[PDB]
Write a protein that binds this ligand. Sequence first.
Ligand SMILES: C[N+]1(C)[C@@H]2CC[C@H]1C[C@H](OC1c3ccccc3CCc3ccccc31)C2
Lengths: 205, 205, 205, 205, 205
Amino acid sequence: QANLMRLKSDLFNRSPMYPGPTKDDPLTVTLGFTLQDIVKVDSSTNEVDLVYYEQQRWKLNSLMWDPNEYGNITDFRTSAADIWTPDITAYSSTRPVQVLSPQIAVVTHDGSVMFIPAQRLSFMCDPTGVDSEEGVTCAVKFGSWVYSGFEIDLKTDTDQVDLSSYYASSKYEILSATQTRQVQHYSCCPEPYIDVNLVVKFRER
Amino acid sequence: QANLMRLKSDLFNRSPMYPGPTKDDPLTVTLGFTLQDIVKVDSSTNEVDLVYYEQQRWKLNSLMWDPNEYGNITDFRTSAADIWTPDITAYSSTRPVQVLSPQIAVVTHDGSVMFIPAQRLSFMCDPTGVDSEEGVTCAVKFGSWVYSGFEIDLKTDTDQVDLSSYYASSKYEILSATQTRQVQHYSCCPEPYIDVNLVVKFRER
Amino acid sequence: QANLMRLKSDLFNRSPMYPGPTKDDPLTVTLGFTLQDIVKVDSSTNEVDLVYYEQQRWKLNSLMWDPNEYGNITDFRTSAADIWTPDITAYSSTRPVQVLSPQIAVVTHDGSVMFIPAQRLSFMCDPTGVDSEEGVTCAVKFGSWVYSGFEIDLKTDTDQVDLSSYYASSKYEILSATQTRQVQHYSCCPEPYIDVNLVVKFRER
Amino acid sequence: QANLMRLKSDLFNRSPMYPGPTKDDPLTVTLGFTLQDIVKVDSSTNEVDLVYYEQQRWKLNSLMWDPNEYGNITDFRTSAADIWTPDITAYSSTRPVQVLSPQIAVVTHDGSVMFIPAQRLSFMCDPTGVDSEEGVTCAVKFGSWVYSGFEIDLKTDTDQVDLSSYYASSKYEILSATQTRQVQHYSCCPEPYIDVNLVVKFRER
Amino acid sequence: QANLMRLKSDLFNRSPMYPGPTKDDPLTVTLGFTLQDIVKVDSSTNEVDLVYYEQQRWKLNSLMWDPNEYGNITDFRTSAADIWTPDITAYSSTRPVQVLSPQIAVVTHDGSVMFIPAQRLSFMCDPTGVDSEEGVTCAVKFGSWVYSGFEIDLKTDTDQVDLSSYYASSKYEILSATQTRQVQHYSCCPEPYIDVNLVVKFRER
Ligand SMILES: C[N+]1(C)[C@@H]2CC[C@H]1C[C@H](OC1c3ccccc3CCc3ccccc31)C2
């Protein structure tokens, strides 16, 4: 602990916080979903509720250190409030997202940060058909709220949503779940926007 | 980031916060709504739930900078807690407004601030009739809570509410949505009050 | 803003906060209600929900200033957390009060403070009869929770609750609404106890 | 206010906070309940909701002063966060306790503290029979969560729960309410444990 | 109190907080559950609510002291915010956990910390069958959210969940309740994660 205390002190107290990316200085955030459960479906409001882990990865120069200088410490855990985090948001939620997990990130010597909040999300989705055999399809985009693709580049490692943790006895079985990077384009504005479209196909039972 | 850190430092640490407008020193706030979804109607309580983005714009001299002096930075993003924000409020909500988006603002070198929170709002509205053609109409005024028109002047760029992001599969289709600036007077009160009246006409299906 | 910043600095940063009234040094708070809507009734728990504005006024010597010394500023707005506020509470609520408005007060050069929070309140009342023509009476008292009438004297400008903003299409029409100052005593104790009794008579439709 | 500011300063800023009682240095806390309302019973979960005021009294040497040295001030009010408070807890709640009143205490020159939070509490309780003639009896203990009877001695002034404020039109009439100090010995532990057992007998109507 | 104040000062003010364990410096946390009540099931959403005490024990060198140097004080109580706590989390909750008890820990001279928060948890569980005699079996996993088994080793004293406080009149009787230590080797990674699998078999009545 002697060493880790010093490391944390050097990174967080001697330095101002990282002010977020700029166009001259962009950042890549890697996003990945582990879909845990579809909890609730509401025919009368068209909200559906998901529980998932949202994996977030990025890398900052200002978070790098030589392990040799800190008793061979390769990585540590720290409160998410101690560091900058990206403003990744569901574009079509209907309630504030509920955080199910401690807000703690893992920081590695190479400057990598990994942050994996578990969340319950209510979002817009017409479940009409979910009792049929062919099921229904819903979609929610995740993106930075205020950063364009010039400042924050979104990325996935795979378009397969991780289903290895899906609640086996959920009221709803998952037929397919994909996470797809998209580049929104508008004649409002001569610059791109990046989101990840979480598309879930599911049915009852 | 070298430059942005210094810029934020110069603006926010060396200076006291902006103390809000005065009558000798008023401020114009521009308001605009992007209506996302009418989520829920409650006929027994006459309450209706909206999800929308509320675009807010204003301009402060104390937030200006010459880009040349900060590595050609034209704008940045910052926590809304870092700056003064107007106290725009729904005049007839029945529950505290739920914030759906990160509280982050965009500040431009000319001193412009842009803040676009996503919100869910329950407000007073008698939905009786919504199951027809011709549908039902509901209104809600948004205004400063404590500043008169002498201190804060409200404005819109257009009386058309932005409907380009309305949930196509909402339980409710929008017939029309306007945002209209009103000045009120009141027997009690020498000074003018300004609001923007959000009027939405909608029906089921 | 040059002057207001100085004024706020002089009042709030050079001075300790006001520590609340004492018996040798009492305070008068003026209370008034603007009743906005009766939202819901629950005949199964006997709770009713009101939305109202609660007008609070009091005056502190420590909040006075000569406008001439601060560029003719007569009054300003500030976060309620910057100043002492009285602990006015509903004596018979069943849920924590929900705050519907920004917590901002108006301070005037004469030492007056005006604070007008919008609130939603669930309180004990038995609505049995509300479907009749002659309606039903509910009452809730509000006073200080911890100050006796030796320290805080409550007062109203009028016993008429302001009904000029009542939701015209509420499920409940208001037959009468009064706000009445009351002094009780307790055996054990010389000190008088003050409250304002909000009595509301209402019926369906 | 001149004197009170100084008194508060002397007690709270020049001194560390009181660290809580020890076995060599125990503390008596006096508890009393004012039962305001039984809001609901839930027969499908065995939860029952109470609204009450829980009077708490204790006495600390470190909170004493000679009134003569502070302009004859006998007592003052202060935020409960300014002082140590005992960790009195319902042993069988099913939801976090909801605070209904400002968190302010009254401190007297003799070192007495009085703290009276109003709360809504959902506890365990099988209401089966509450519609019958004799109705039912639920109980909930209150006691320190982490201090044994060697550190915190609980006490009541009376075993009668104060019913003088019970909502006359509650859905439930109170047949009897007692508060009884229990010295419990657990077979895990050599220390004695105290609690106050709030026993309420009630029925419908 | 003279001595305790000094002890707390020496431990918490002169020293930085404990920065959490590292692989070169791991920590054992001992977990144990006291199951208090199964409160509610929702066969519609497949969620189940438990109330339990979660006993947590660990030991830190930095929390040791010689009782002789502090007036023979063997142990003390302190706010859990004053010390590091492990990030033990339910892996399959569907709502944020509700804390029912004061957040206070007991620290012993040997460096032991004991922390026993009472909680209400809604987690994923298909109750279909609970009305039979055989009953239904449900399972929830608890463990660190961000520390691998290289940093935090979980342990139980017993695989028997403590049932000596179970609500005798709960809607649900407990047929069996076990807490079992597991080693899991999830998706991405070469490093184990440790969990305690809380398995509860129950039925109505
Ligand atoms: C809101 N209160 C706290 C105000 C008015 C109703 C309720 C109860 C009352 O407090 C009294 C009281 C009177 C004299 C000295 C101390 C106290 C506080 C304890 C207490 C306990 C039971 C009933 C009344 C009071 C004052």
